[PDB]
């Protein structure tokens, strides 16, 4: 494959003015300042950029690049995207199971994986866990090699690398560039963008492209770059990295002087004549859910720190709450104690579901990259990150709290009420989680999302029905009580528990209540808060919570579908 | 200045094997891998390392290193330490009041500041802000120039720098080093630790120290290291960066072999021979409180975001809470509504105090640098940064909330109840902030500092007196209610507000209460919760609060006196 680009111009001020050149099979590189065009000409050349701006005809072997280009190509990310909880083998297997052809057997698949990991060099480090912050990881060179290895599986012809060295000590850079060189000796077109390279790298380059502030200051063979500037009038000193010399020409030994001197050089005319001569899904759905749910389940268990922290804090809070409220009595303090513990449970679920913000904000980058590459679709990814990150997590505390506290406290000792309480707490957990996802999906930063969730939650807590009596608010503001999840959770719990109780020792009020203002039964307390006393009165809260779950997950799915993928 | 080190060794793994040489007047650097004595020898030579490890002998001009060295040398920190909101002239003024001599007049001080801004090359921006994340900041190069100049006002002789050009571009690091050379041509022996330079900088040195893994690999004229590595059996190609050349030699194109070859050359013999020949408060407490508080205040004004958002959210919450709770009635819902709004105000004060973790945590490094430099004492700095950053920022919400919601709601319309409520809200805000400081003082990362605060506030809010009756807990646990600040706040507010009320229309229960279980007055409700009815029962809640402040502040102060400055 020999990519080519003529008259490319990008518009979000045109960051890319006019670019012409051919990329023969070798080891070419695009380097410029931070204020040049480095991080954009690659996403242009790799179809990672919007087709709106560009105007030239980026064409391979004459054939204008088809629509299946992106899944056919391979583009290594700037930083590393591999998962720290799985091992190198699982990483190279999850990428070889969604990009390969389902018609082939696992024998050929694992054989190709073995060839890849054995030619790359991580065969000695095959089964070793890649590593997260907590667990001892593998060398960063091996991390970059693993990332380079999750794109050799499909066997492309063109490999794009954006900044393969930004984040590596000067030790591993030579080895990684030698690895790339060894790849390029077999017929792969490697196109990478680099940040101030050392001469221990620049020696082996085939073709150089210099992008100085949105213009093409040079494109041609890279051995003939110092000869370009020495015959331009300057002097070639010694003991200086020629790439730093190039990046220093842009900053005082203007930008529109060299850019118009280059068009005068034969490296423009000869290549333009050459170019004028030249011009003259792969997987199922359930398959795209199996491996996503698998990788997510591994990464959630493989990172026991967060999940065990959750379960430990939940068991400890449950035992503390069971010891403080141990043995609820049926007297004047009984109503206050029951209302307080139920409020605390329904509010703990909501305020602890603020950690669902890390689901899609910590994983935004890899999601976008994998989707643009073509592993899966948005719906399969949604369902495979929701079946193994929100079902096995938010279901546990709802069962643990209900197992521990329900019998230490002494709540309603009946077969159904126990499971109804458990189900209610589960629904509150899932609804707060869905709302956190709706507010958080697509947002690249965590802090503003956490602030929004916190403000929404304190307002719903105000309208929950313990602080202010929901039947005393002025009618022009009372409708605000229907937009709050804690209110439905607390209403369901209060209904489930307060129905058949008495709180006045010696006083049977079920008959004729003497001397009102007493609040001597659970039904009087229930109606004072504005709560129905029918089974529909209990189950409409669950209907509302289900509808909230549906609406919020639909909003999250729409925010994932319409996201700016380029 | 002529610094001269000898036979130094440091241990917590004794890191520095054996060092030897002088640092003559000129411009001399130390470079090498990240694991040598690069960030170690410079910290040791400048008396900033803990002196319990040094086994060698430092010397300034033959005499042992004097005590006032820290106040007679200049240690320019690597990264930025200047305040963002203050101005290039205000910073040079604040770093000129506390370090200089109060005997002299402001005429002399401003003359010195002027002759300093002349040399520093900043006569164009002296009157404009240095800049922060929100306001348009001056270029980072002028930031670094300002941070340097802040250490020229005392006119030290020895200037110590560390990685002065890490976080810059190519042509600005060159300007920084040209400025440093223009400084060093005065007799001011500059000594900096550089990191992977381009030879353009390397050409302007006068002595050099290669430190790899903790061994002197070379020391002497920095126009000789290439000659020292050439005449040892190596070859240097053109177009290589000599600093990168040595940092590649350190990896072997072996530490304990290149670390032993040096001893057997003349560039060790000469240094050791010349060495063996050469070896054979400034301000009143008020002048430190005034300027510290003044600088902190000027920095607060130059921060519209935080303080303006605080005021805005307090006003919005005041109006929302006065709308929801507008016109508290004296009926059965009155007790619930009053308890709810007072509980809400107290937990608001507490959970909003959490935002004071960034007071002694985000300005840590600057504190350590300025204290070791000899700016001020711990008590003066503590009282300064606690009388402008915290004193007038916790008074305003407790004023706005009272003034706004006291007459919308319709609380006790007497002259002193209003002021008691304001005083209580301010006291509980101050106590919660004191606890926040006691936890956050002496921690470098915010997250682990905020998790514990949120846990403690959740526990205190459980024990605060609304979610559980404090008279019903078992005695082996009921003593924990004396560790809750929200409990004292909420008890004082309830006492001040509930005392002389009736809540049953048509029933006068002041004398005989007919049909008890009714709760028809404020005395009944107050005693039901375990609160006193005498005036002492209002003010113990206050002394406790005051006590906590004192105690917690003391703790914070101690966590700043025994904090490991070195």
């Amino acid at each position: 494959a020999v990519l080519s680009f003529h008259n490319i111009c990008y518009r979000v001020k045109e960051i890319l003015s006019n670019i012409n050149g051919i990329m023969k099979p070798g080891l070419n590189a695009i380097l410029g300042p931070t204020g040049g065009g480095k991080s954009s000409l690659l996403d242009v050349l790799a179809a990672r950029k919007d087709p709106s701006g560009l105007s030239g005809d980026v064409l391979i072997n004459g054939a204008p690049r088809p629509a299946n280009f992106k899944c056919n190509s391979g583009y290594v990310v700037q930083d590393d995207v591999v998962m720290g909880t799985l091992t190198v083998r699982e990483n190279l297997q999850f990428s070889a199971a969604l990009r390969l052809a389902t018609t082939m057997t696992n024998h050929e698949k694992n054989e190709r994986i073995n060839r890849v990991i054995q030619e790359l060099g991580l065969d000695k480090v095959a089964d070793s866990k890649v590593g997260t912050q907590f667990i001892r990881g593998v060398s960063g060179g091996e991390r970059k090699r693993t990332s380079i290895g999750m794109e050799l599986i499909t066997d492309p012809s063109i490999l794009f690398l954006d900044e393969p060295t930004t984040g590596l000590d000067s030790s591993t850079a030579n080895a990684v560039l030698l690895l790339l060189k060894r790849m390029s000796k077999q017929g792969r077109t490697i196109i990478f963008s680099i940040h101030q390279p050392r001469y221990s790298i620049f020696k082996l380059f085939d073709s150089l492209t210099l992008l100085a502030s949105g213009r093409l200051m040079f494109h041609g063979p890279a051995q003939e770059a110092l000869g370009y500037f020495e015959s331009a009038g300057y002097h070639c000193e010694a003991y200086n990295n020629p790439a730093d010399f190039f990046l220093d020409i842009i900053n005082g030994d203007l930008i529109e002087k060299l850019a118009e001197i280059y068009v005068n050089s034969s490296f423009y005319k000869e290549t333009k004549a050459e170019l004028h001569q030249l011009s003259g899904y792969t997987t199922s759905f359930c398959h795209q859910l199996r491996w996503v749910s698998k990788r997510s389940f591994k990464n959630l268990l493989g990172n026991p720190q967060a999940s065990i922290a959750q379960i430990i804090v939940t068991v400890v809070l449950g035992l503390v709450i069971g010891a403080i409220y141990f043995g609820l009595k049926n007297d004047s303090t009984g109503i206050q104690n029951r209302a307080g513990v139920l409020f605390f449970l329904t509010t703990n679920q909501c305020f602890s579901s603020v950690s669902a913000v890390e689901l899609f904000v910590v994983e935004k980058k890899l999601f976008i990259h994998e989707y643009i590459s073509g592993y899966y679709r948005v719906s399969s990814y949604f369902l495979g990150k929701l079946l193994s990150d929100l079902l096995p997590m938010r279901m546990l505390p709802s069962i643990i709290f209900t197992c521990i506290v329900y019998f230490m406290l002494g709540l309603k000792p009946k077969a159904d009420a126990f499971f109804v309480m458990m189900f209610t707490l589960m629904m509150v957990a899932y609804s707060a989680s869905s709302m956190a996802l709706a507010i958080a999906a697509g947002q690249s930063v965590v802090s503003v999302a956490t602030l929004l969730m916190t403000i929404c939650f304190v307002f719903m807590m105000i309208f929950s029905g313990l602080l202010v009596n929901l039947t005393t608010i002025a009618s022009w503001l009372s409708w605000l009580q229907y937009f709050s999840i804690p209110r439905y959770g607390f209403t369901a719990l209060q209904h489930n528990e307060f129905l058949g109780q008495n709180f006045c020792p010696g006083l049977n009020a079920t008959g004729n209540n003497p001397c009102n203002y007493a609040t001597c039964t659970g039904e009087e307390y229930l109606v004072k808060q504005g709560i129905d006393l029918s089974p529909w009165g209990l189950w409409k809260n669950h209907v509302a919570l289900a509808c909230m779950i549906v609406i919020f997950l639909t909003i999250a799915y729409l925010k994932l579908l319409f996201l700016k993928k380029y | 200045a002529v610094l001269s080190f000898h036979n130094i060794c440091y241990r917590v793994k004794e890191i520095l094997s054996n060092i030897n040489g002088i640092m003559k007047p000129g411009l001399n650097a130390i470079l090498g891998p990240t694991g040598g004595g690069k960030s170690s020898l410079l910290d040791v030579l400048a008396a900033r390392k803990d002196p319990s490890g040094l086994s060698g002998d430092v010397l300034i001009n033959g005499a042992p290193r004097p005590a006032n060295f820290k106040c007679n040398s200049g240690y320019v920190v690597q990264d930025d330490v200047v305040m963002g909101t203050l101005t290039v002239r205000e910073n040079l003024q604040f770093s000129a009041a506390l370090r200089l001599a109060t005997t002299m007049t402001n005429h002399e001080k401003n003359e010195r500041i002027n002759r300093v801004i002349q040399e520093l090359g900043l006569d164009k921006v002296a009157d404009s802000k240095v800049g922060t994340q929100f306001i348009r900041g001056v270029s980072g190069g002028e930031r670094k120039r300002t941070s340097i100049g802040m250490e020229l006002i005392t006119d030290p002789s020895i200037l110590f720098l560390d990685e002065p050009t890490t976080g810059l571009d190519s042509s600005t690091a060159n300007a920084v080093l040209l400025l440093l050379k223009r400084m060093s041509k005065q007799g001011r022996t500059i000594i900096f630790s550089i990191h992977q330079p381009r030879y353009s900088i390397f050409k302007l040195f006068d002595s050099l120290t290669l430190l790899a893994s903790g061994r002197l690999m070379f020391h002497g004229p920095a126009q000789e290291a290439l000659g020292y590595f050439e005449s040892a059996g190596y070859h240097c190609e053109a177009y290589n960066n000599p600093a990168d050349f040595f940092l590649d030699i350190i990896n072997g194109d072996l530490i304990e072999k290149l670390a032993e070859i040096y001893v057997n050359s003349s560039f060790y013999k000469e240094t050791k021979a010349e060495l063996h020949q050469l070896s054979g408060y400034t301000t009143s407490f008020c002048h430190q409180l005034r300027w510290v508080s003044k600088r902190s205040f000027k920095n607060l004004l130059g921060n519209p975001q935080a303080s303006i958002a605080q005021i805005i959210v307090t006003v919005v919450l005041g109006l929302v809470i006065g709308a929801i709770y507008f016109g508290l009635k004296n009926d059965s819902t009155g007790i619930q509504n009053r308890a709810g709004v007072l509980f809400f105000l107290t937990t608001n004060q507490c959970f909003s105090s959490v935002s004071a973790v960034e007071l002694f945590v985000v300005e840590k490094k600057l504190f350590i640098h300025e204290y070791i430099s000899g700016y001020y004492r711990v008590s003066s700095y503590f009282l300064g940064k606690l009388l402008s950053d915290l004193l007038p920022m916790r008074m305003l919400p407790s004023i706005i909330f009272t003034c706004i919601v006291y007459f919308m709601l319709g609380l006790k319309p007497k002259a002193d109840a209003f002021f008691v409520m304001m005083f209580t809200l301010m006291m509980v805000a101050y106590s919660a902030s004191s606890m926040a400081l006691a936890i956050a003082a002496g921690q470098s990362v915010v997250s682990v500092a905020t998790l514990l605060m949120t846990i403690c506030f959740v526990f205190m809010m459980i024990f605060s007196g609304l979610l559980v009756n404090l008279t019903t807990i078992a005695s082996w646990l009921s003593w924990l209610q004396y560790f809750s600040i929200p409990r004292y706040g909420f008890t004082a507010l309830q006492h001040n507000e509930f005392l002389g009320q009736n809540f049953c229309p048509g029933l006068n229960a002041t004398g005989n209460n007919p049909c008890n279980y009714a709760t028809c007055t404020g005395e009944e409700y107050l005693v039901k919760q375990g609160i006193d009815l005498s005036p002492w029962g209002l003010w113990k809640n206050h002394v406790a609060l005051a006590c906590m402040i004192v105690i917690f502040l003391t703790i914070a102060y101690l966590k700043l006196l025994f904090l490991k400055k070195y």
Partner: antibody
Framework: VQLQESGPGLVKPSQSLSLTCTVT?????????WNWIRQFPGKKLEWMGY???????TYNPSLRGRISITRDTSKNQFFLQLRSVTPEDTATYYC????????????WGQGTSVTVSS | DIVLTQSPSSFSVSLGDRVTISCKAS??????LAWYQQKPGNAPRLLIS???SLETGFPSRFSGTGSGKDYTLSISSLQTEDVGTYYC?????????FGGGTKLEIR
């Protein structure tokens, strides 16, 4: 306790109306709440508001800004001031008494017809 | 606001036969239901308080039975001194609302 009512039995439209009631046999600052209750032609009933034994007052939300109840604690009286009258306020007023520990309107007045015309 | 309703806004009955009046409400009143009896030209005179109890000066004929949102007064064997309107008041919530009143008649 026994209640008496007095006032003008005819007011001109878009004006004020003022009724008074003397409570003999009890103290209107001792125990109960004291309300006004009007009965239309056609025999519908409507509670208007009450003044408490301690001064607090609460009115029917249908009459906002149009009704005030005040008390002369010196000579045991309370007063109904119904401003911005209309011809549809052609009913008796009764001025009943409400205990509170029992909940019901225990004692009633005698009723005085008030016609509103011109 | 809780709005009472005496669906049989009239009744017709001879002397000595049982009669039953219903006062279905529009919310849970929780036995906070009172029955007043108004005569021609007099003020109402409380007859039942609490939807079950009975006041003094009245015989044991009048009875009150109900729960939830449905309550009924029951006059078994009504005599001559029983004609007149019957209002059902609730004293649960803040605006105390009355019923339409079922004017009894005789035959």
């Amino acid at each position: 306790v026994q209640l008496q009512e007095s006032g003008p039995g005819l007011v001109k439209p878009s004006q004020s109306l003022s009724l008074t009631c003397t409570v003999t046999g009890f103290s209107i600052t001792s125990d109960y709440a004291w309300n006004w209750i009007r009965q239309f032609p056609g025999k519908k009933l409507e509670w208007m508001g009450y003044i408490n034994f301690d001064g607090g007052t609460t009115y029917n939300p249908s009459l906002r800004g149009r009704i005030s109840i005040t008390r002369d604690t010196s000579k045991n009286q309370f007063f109904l001031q119904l401003r911005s009258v209309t011809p549809e306020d052609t009913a008796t007023y009764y001025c009943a008494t409400f205990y509170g520990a029992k909940g019901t309107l225990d004692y009633w007045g005698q009723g005085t017809s008030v016609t509103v015309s011109s | 606001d809780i709005v009472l309703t005496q669906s049989p806004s009239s009744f017709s009955v001879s002397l000595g036969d049982r009669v039953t009046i219903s006062c279905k409400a529009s919310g849970y009143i929780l036995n906070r239901l009172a029955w007043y009896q108004q005569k021609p030209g007099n003020a109402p005179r409380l007859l039942i308080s609490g939807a079950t109890s009975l006041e003094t000066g009245f015989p044991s004929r009048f009875s009150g039975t109900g729960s939830g949102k449905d309550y009924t007064l029951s006059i078994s064997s009504l005599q001559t001194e029983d004609v007149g309107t019957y209002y059902c008041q609730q004293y649960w919530s803040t605006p105390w609302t009355f019923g339409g009143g079922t004017k009894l008649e005789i035959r």
